[PDB]
Amino acid sequence: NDIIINKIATIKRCIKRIQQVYGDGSQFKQDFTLQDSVILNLQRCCEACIDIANHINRQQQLGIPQSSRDSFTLLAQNNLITQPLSDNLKKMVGLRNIAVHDYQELNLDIVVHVVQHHLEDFEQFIDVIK
């Protein structure tokens, strides 16, 4: 389905941008410009995964979630993704909310740990869906 195809290409395109942009990582906890780029491309990864999830929930007639977190819950309850992946992608959404709408409480250590260790929830989602 072209919807999934385009969202998947977006997820890969954007996680490469996060990696290129967060290079050695030394210019990260200072320098807000590169923080902005990483946070935006993380949102675009989240939004594309949420669109995939929203699309599948409607087509498989699982219910229409009125929040992005309910959308991943619905895929877990019907066993289209493993629940380990469900709760980690819910964490990404939760971190985007803070990173975009409320940086002044953004830890940024959690961002950097997500940049290095938890991106591998997006690949895992791309691989399951495909």
């Binding site: 949420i50 087509q59 229409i64 009125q66 929040s67």
Partner: protein, 124 residues
């Protein structure tokens, strides 16, 4: 309810039509009463508002019932979500239906986060 008459009338009257939905009461069991037939359309352009109201009354006369014709391109996000949720697609490609649904549900999810405090206020 004659769905083929609905499809022909809108196809004949709306340029570059893309999606026809029946929604509301007449989809999912039809509710008799004086209730309107609720129809939503997506075309390449926004319809002229007055021309859309005229088209609705022309459908209303053909169907012998009150018709409400909703242009999805200018409709609210709440209303687009209802069409996406309970609507029955009468015409248009499956891909145009999925593009519209994905865009709608995403916009609706962002709206719910934005306005949840207003909804909780007025509901208690």
């Amino acid at each position: 309810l004659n769905e083929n008459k609905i499809i022909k009338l809108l196809r004949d009257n709306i340029p570059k039509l893309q999606l026809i939905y029946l929604f509301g009461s007449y989809s999912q069991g039809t509710q008799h009463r004086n209730s309107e037939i609720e129809i939503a359309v997506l075309a390449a352009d926004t319809l002229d508002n007055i021309a859309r109201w005229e088209l609705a009354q022309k459908l209303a006369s053909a169907l012998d019932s009150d018709v409400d014709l909703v242009d999805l391109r200018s409709a609210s996000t709440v209303l687009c979500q209802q069409v996406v949720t309970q609507g029955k697609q009468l015409w248009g490609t499956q891909q145009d239906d999925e593009l519209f649904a994905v865009k709608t549900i995403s916009m609706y999810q962002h709206l719910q986060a934005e306005r949840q405090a207003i909804i909780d206020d007025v509901m208690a």
